[PDB]
Structure formats: C-alpha cells, structure tokens
Assembly symmetry: D3
Homo-oligomer: 149 residues x 6
Amino acid sequence: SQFFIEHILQILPHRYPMLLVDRITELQANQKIVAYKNITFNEDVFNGHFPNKPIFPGVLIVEGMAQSGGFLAFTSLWGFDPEIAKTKIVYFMTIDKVKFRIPVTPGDRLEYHLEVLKHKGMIWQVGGTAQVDGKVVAEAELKAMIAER
Amino acid sequence: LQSQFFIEHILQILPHRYPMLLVDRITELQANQKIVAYKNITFNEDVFNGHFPNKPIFPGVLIVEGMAQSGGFLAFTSLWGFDPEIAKTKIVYFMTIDKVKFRIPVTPGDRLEYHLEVLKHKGMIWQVGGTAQVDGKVVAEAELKAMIAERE
Amino acid sequence: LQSQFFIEHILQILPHRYPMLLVDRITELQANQKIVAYKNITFNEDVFNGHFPNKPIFPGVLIVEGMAQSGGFLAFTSLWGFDPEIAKTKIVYFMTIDKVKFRIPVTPGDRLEYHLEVLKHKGMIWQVGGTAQVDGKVVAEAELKAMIAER
Amino acid sequence: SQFFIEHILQILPHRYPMLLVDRITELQANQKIVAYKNITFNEDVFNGHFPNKPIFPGVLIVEGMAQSGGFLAFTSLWGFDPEIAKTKIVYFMTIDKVKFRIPVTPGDRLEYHLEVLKHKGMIWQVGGTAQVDGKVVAEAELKAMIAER
Amino acid sequence: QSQFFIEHILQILPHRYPMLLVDRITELQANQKIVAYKNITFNEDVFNGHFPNKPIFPGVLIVEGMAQSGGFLAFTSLWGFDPEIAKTKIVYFMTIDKVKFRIPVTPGDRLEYHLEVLKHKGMIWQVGGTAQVDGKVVAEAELKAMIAERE
Amino acid sequence: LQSQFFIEHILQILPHRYPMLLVDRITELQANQKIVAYKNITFNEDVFNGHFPNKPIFPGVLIVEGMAQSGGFLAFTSLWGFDPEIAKTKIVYFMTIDKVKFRIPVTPGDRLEYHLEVLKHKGMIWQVGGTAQVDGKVVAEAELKAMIAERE
Ligand SMILES: CC(C)(C)c1ccc(C(=O)N/N=C/c2cc(Br)c(O)c(Br)c2O)cc1
Ligand SMILES: CC(C)(C)c1ccc(C(=O)N/N=C/c2cc(Br)c(O)c(Br)c2O)cc1
Ligand SMILES: [Cl-]
Ligand SMILES: [Cl-]
Ligand SMILES: [Cl-]
Ligand SMILES: [Cl-]
Ligand SMILES: [Cl-]
Ligand SMILES: [Cl-]
C-alpha cells in the first residue's frame, strides 16, 4: 500500500513541475487509494498564485486527485509494472461535481482520497475528496480512459 | 466599457502572475453577458517540461483555469468596469466546477481561445459556462460558479 | 518531404530545448529555398519576468534566434530530410548576423511568424534572410549565417 | 506562537527559491523554536539533486535550520515587528558539528528544532536538530548575524 | 563614477532575471566607451536548452549583453548615476549590424563587453565593439538605439 | 590523470545537475591530494530571486555545497580515474560539515574559487577541507566528509 516518489516516478509519466503526488499511503485494487502531496512555499506556482498570498491552485488540487485516480486504475489492472506503464496513457475525459471548501496553503499535507465509483473496460470513474488535517478541502469526480501510449 | 483588452490591462485587473496568469488577450467583452479571450500556447512554457517529456500537452486543468480567469475578468468588469484601484482589493475564487469535458488535446502552436457566457449572476456570485476552442473546434467545455471576495 | 511539421517533429530535428527552443510549428517548407514557421508568444514565459516588469516585451534578440532556428530547420531537412538519427549527431551555431531592424514590439498574444529564404548555402554553411511578422506586418528583419556541425 | 507563511514572510527577508520554512509551531523568546518545511517533489531543486533520485540537499536542511534560528532571533530582539524586519537581511557566520543521519525526500515533513546557545546584539548562536516523523535526520550548530540591508 | 556593481546596475537598467546580462562595470568614460562583464556559469537556466550535454552561451545573448552595456553607457553619459531619472527612460534598440561570432562562450568564462560610442545624434546612439574572454575577441557587433521617455 | 577539466568533463563525473551543479571548471587536480576549481557567480542565477531581493548574496550553504562537489570530483577520479560509465550510477551523500566560517559575501561578478585538500579518505568516505576564494582572498573556509555511493 505504501509507494514512495521513486515508485510513483516509474508509473506516472508526469514530471516537474506537473507531478503532484508525493507518496501513496493506501491502495486497494479496484476500490480505493489514499495519497498525498506536501505543499510548501518553495514551489514555483506560488510566485503567481498569488503574490503576497500563497494559495495552492484549486485546479491543481484536482490534477493531484486525477493523478492519484489514474495511479489507482493503472495499478488495479497491472499492479506495479514499470514496463507496461510506459505502454499506456491515462488521460481524463471528464471532471464533475467539483467543490472547493477550504484554501490549501504552504505547510499543508494535501491528502487525496479517491475510490472507484464505476469501471468498465478501460473506462474508470473515480471520485472522492482532498483533505488537510482531517478536513475536506475539495471534492470531485473524474472519468478517465486507459489507452496504448 | 471596452471590448478589447491586452496583457497590460489584464495585469491591472487579475491578481494572477507568472506562472499562473493564463490569459493573454481579450477580443470580445459584453458586460453581464460574455467574454472571448485567448492564451497562446508555446513550447517555451515551463509546464511542458513535465507534461509530458517528449510529448508536450497543455494540462486540461489549466485550460479550465484559463476559462475561470476569463470569467473572473468578465465578472469584475461587469460590476466595476475597468477599475484597477478596486481590482487590487478584490479576488475571484472558484466555488465549483461542473460538466467539464476534454475533447481535443491542446499543444504548442495552438491559440487557446476562451468563450465564457454568464449563466446567472447575483451580486458577487457568478455562474459562467462555455468552451475552450482552437481554430474553431471545441477542445474543452466547462461550467463554474465563482465568488468575488475581499483580498483581505 | 512534408511542408508542415509540429512541435513533435521540431523536437526530433532541432537540438534546442527549453528555454531556448523558440519555434513551435512549421507551416511552409521548400527545400533549399524557404521556410515559414512561427512561435506563439504568451505571458506564461519566464523571459517576461525580466523583460520587463509590468511591461512584457519579447526580446528582439530572441526574435532573431527564432529566425535562426527556422533557418537551421530548413538547412538540415534540405540536406537530410526528416532524419532524427542524423539530426542528433549535429548542432548548429551562429556565424554572423546582419541588417537586423526592429520595427514593432512583440508582446503576449502575438503569433510571431518567421519568413526565411536561402540567400546562399554551401555544405554545412547556410546564409538565410527574411522577416518576422505579426498579423501580416513586419516587426523585424534580419540576415544571418549559420553552420551545422558534428559532436 | 503559531505563525504561518504570511507571518514568516513579514519577518524573514528570504524569498523564492530560498525561503525554506513553511510554518512555526512553537516559539519561546531567547530559548527555542520548532518549525517545519514540507518537502514535495514539486520543488525545482530536485531536478538536479539528483536526477531519478530526489534527495533534499543537506546544506538546505542546514539553511532551513538557520532561517528558523533567524526568525527566533528577529522576534526575540524586536518581537513581531514587520517594519523593523523589512530593513534587515541575515548573514551566515559559522557552521559546525553538523551530521546527517537520514536522507530527507519528497513526502517528508522536515521539522526544525533549534535552541539558543548564545547571543549578543545581532549575533546569534543556535544549535539543534532537523527531524522527520520524530526521528533525527540531522544535527547542527550555527552562528548568524542580522544586518541593515 | 568608474566602477559600478550589481546594485548600481539594477538601479539604472530595467532588466531583471532572467534578462539582466551584465554583472559589473569595470570601466566607464562618459560619451566614449564602456568595459563591463557577465560571468558565465552552468547554473543558468538557458543552459538547460542550449544545449543538452553541451552548454554554450547563446550568441544572441552576447549581443544582448552588449546592447545592455551600450544602454548603460548612453544613459550614464546623459544623466550620470541617477536611479530616479532612470525609472522614466527607455532605450529602444533599433538595429544590430555586422555581428560575427569567432569563439563559443561556455560556463566558466568571464564574458567582457567592450563598447564604444560610434555616433550620437540627438536621441540616437550608435555603439559598437566586442565581447572578449581572456583577452581574445569572441564576438563583434554594432548597434543603434534611441533614447525615449518611459510611459 | 589530467589536471584541467571543463564543464563537459564535470558533467560526466558528478551526478549533480541544474540547479545544483555548482562547479564550472577544474584548474588543478592531484589524485588523493588536492583540487582547485571554481564557479562563476552571476546575477542570472535563480537563487538570487530570493537571496535576497535587491541584495544579491550567493548563499553561504551553497558555497559549502560547491566545495563538497569539488571534493567529490576529486574523490571519484582518485578512485576510478576519469570513467564516465562508472560515474553514471553513483551519487554523493554529505555525512558531516565542520568548522565552517564565512568572512566575505560572495556576489554576482565574483569568480568563486574552491581549494580542497584531502584530510583523510578510506573507501567511499572522503574527509576534505579547505577554502573558497575570490580574487585571492579567503571568502570562506570549511571541513566536510562526503560518501560516494551507488544508486540503489
Ligand atoms: C481527453 C483528450 C482527448 C483531450 C486527450 C486525449 C489524449 C491525450 C494524451 O495523448 N495524453 N497523453 C498522451 C501521451 C503521453 C505520453 Br508521456 C506519450 O509518450 C504519448 Br506518445 C502520448 O500520446 C490527452 C488528452
Ligand atoms: C518596464 C519599464 C518601463 C522599465 C521598461 C519598459 C520598456 C523598456 C523597453 O522597451 N526598452 N528598453 C528599456 C531600456 C532602458 C535602459 Br536605461 C537601457 O539601458 C536599456 Br539597454 C533598455 O532596453 C524598458 C523598460
Ligand atoms: Cl484557486
Ligand atoms: Cl491534461
Ligand atoms: Cl528588445
Ligand atoms: Cl546532501
Ligand atoms: Cl549561438
Ligand atoms: Cl548566507
């Protein structure tokens, strides 16, 4: 269930500054994942969002949830397989029911909670929340398709 | 009351700065009704170092972000017009995002055009929806409700 | 050989990478004769943090760089066609620049179009010249000579 | 005693990408300070330290400890006074007895524990450790000087 | 009056990171010539893309560094070290001519700009000179600029 | 075997990369003994955006990092000679740092010269010591122990 940055880098194609998942704490095939990304002032994004008021972009919180969800889907089908990971692309088709409740700032441990709402073939629907210190800071539902890279 | 604004005017209204100011120019603006704007996409952008190596694709979420900033400009200017002084005291926040669909990937060389329409507005609360287009084709769709709050 | 290439093709031919690959797409290519290409200008470019604060202006020298990169792409595809393997066994370097004029400032939102024609070419030495345009208006002119070399 | 990034910004002169303290959890004038910095893969430093193997630079761990000490120094001297702070900068004078025991990586919450060893005027000597999940990842002593910009 | 460091340069030139390419002024004779330089280090972003595994300071940036040196010369010739007046002026570079690159510039080099006033007629300044590394000429260039009121 | 190495040679030995490769050239090298190298300091470096705004000062800790990297180059070449294929899978870990003292601020325009001497080495563990200099003056002094290791 625990995957670190090294493991993550072998499954996801994302690299700096768009790999928004630092560690995976829980993974239940075909069911759910709990992962997180540490938020620190030392991130380029804060230079512009916003000057004198660092706030992690809501859309990037969603991106982080999507990446966690994609990791879940890929792993549920193929497990930890770097080889096969390079032959697949997990792109997102839709995003819906997104709600932002609390602003995420430097010092926050942005935890992603996604579960498989539904899946058929290579189409997977995940949903859940983003949490900081046990509180729900955002929620969203996403639908992704898995295909040959 | 103007319909065209360039980056210098955008900078005076939106608080966003590099690397999160995703609107380069506004070509159409109709108070309380709609806005048409765009962001040029070029390889010379840091995001492409990671999305993805050897396969530059503009992140769908940033397409949405650009749509929101456009809506936000529309919301503000609809209420106060081009007023930099007051703009510095307000900030627009994403409350919700719905019905997002990504149809075509956006890549360097593309002119990402935002088309937002006002679906409903009451005071500081604005609901907009629209599409992101490239050479006339819809590459993305989205609806979102924003909030015009105090910067402090 | 084709007449249009996208960023994916340009990455396979030019050795330039971020933040110095200043050509996004190729629209017209006529071997040993001319090329029309362009680079989109956006505020979301690091260059603008320093050129200048509160007033984004695409550096004139980078417009020339862009023209040079277009020239280099023409030069190489003229001699080897679309060949990624041979391409990576090369680099191109500026030898001279002349008659450059900066008529109109280039800013975010602009589609910087490069128009180059081969003035002269002999082996790895190419002499190109032309203009940089925005919405059909000349914003800059320049002549440059470059060379493709081994590694 | 609970300071956030915007408070830290008003005291320390450091800015991106050299501001390495995200939050202050404990503060006791002329005694000690406990703070932390989140470590995420989304930090430019990791592009070069090292490729395919992200390790937060040991020297930056020390820098983060120094900044923590600096904040303790500024406040111990003038309390939380953004106006006086804005005129100053901080200079490293000495560094000694530093030992790194465990590598810090993306996903880690790097906590700084510094106490005052000695001080006089603008010159402050502090020492302590850097910890992750309650375990000491580094030790250090350092002397710094606050000066007029 | 002769030696200006980075603090001073920052107060006269509007350029900022990543486009301020002059680190220190070592010699300045009002209305005559300027000698200044920029250190080249591998720890510069441009090297990420110019070129991977082969760091080479872009030729166009050498010309930019020369342009900046000329601008500081022109400005200081007219008003001396005056940060306040500096904030209200701009120097548009109109043309670049006869540039030639003889030796590549790389990390570890101390790129020295040697500019001299070729002509000054009104708001127009024509400067020229060379860029040198360890006493050897690595580049040559002529440039014409216009002094104007900021806005 | 050689005594002078340029940035291309440094890239083939040290694992560090942008923005953490802080050695531009090697001017002297005596196996298992000493090394003299330097890094040019320029305003055009990202660290200066934050250390400090309007007052560029090369971070003291990065000076130490530069000395360590100098020692590392010395350590590796003393072990396997100039062997890029072997160096390709090694990394360097800081173990300790002692008696570091900063005497003069390093600023843009400075040629930061590292002078390291081997105080003791055994296997992968090198205990190196020396100074950093600008125009013949001691700008800093430090003692450090680093360990060369294989990427696992
Ligand atoms: C949802 C839609 C239609 C806009 C879409 C479709 C495809 C893609 C896509 O191609 N994503 N990733 C593609 C990709 C990534 C890497 Br890495 C790669 O080596 C290759 Br070939 C890819 O096609 C993204 C969005
Ligand atoms: C942002 C602001 C107002 C400082 C600004 C705006 C435009 C420009 C510009 O288009 N060109 N040049 C500015 C400039 C000023 C001096 Br004094 C100088 O030595 C050089 Br060379 C310049 O390029 C420069 C600065
Ligand atoms: Cl947001
Ligand atoms: Cl995407
Ligand atoms: Cl320019
Ligand atoms: Cl380390
Ligand atoms: Cl060049
Ligand atoms: Cl320091």
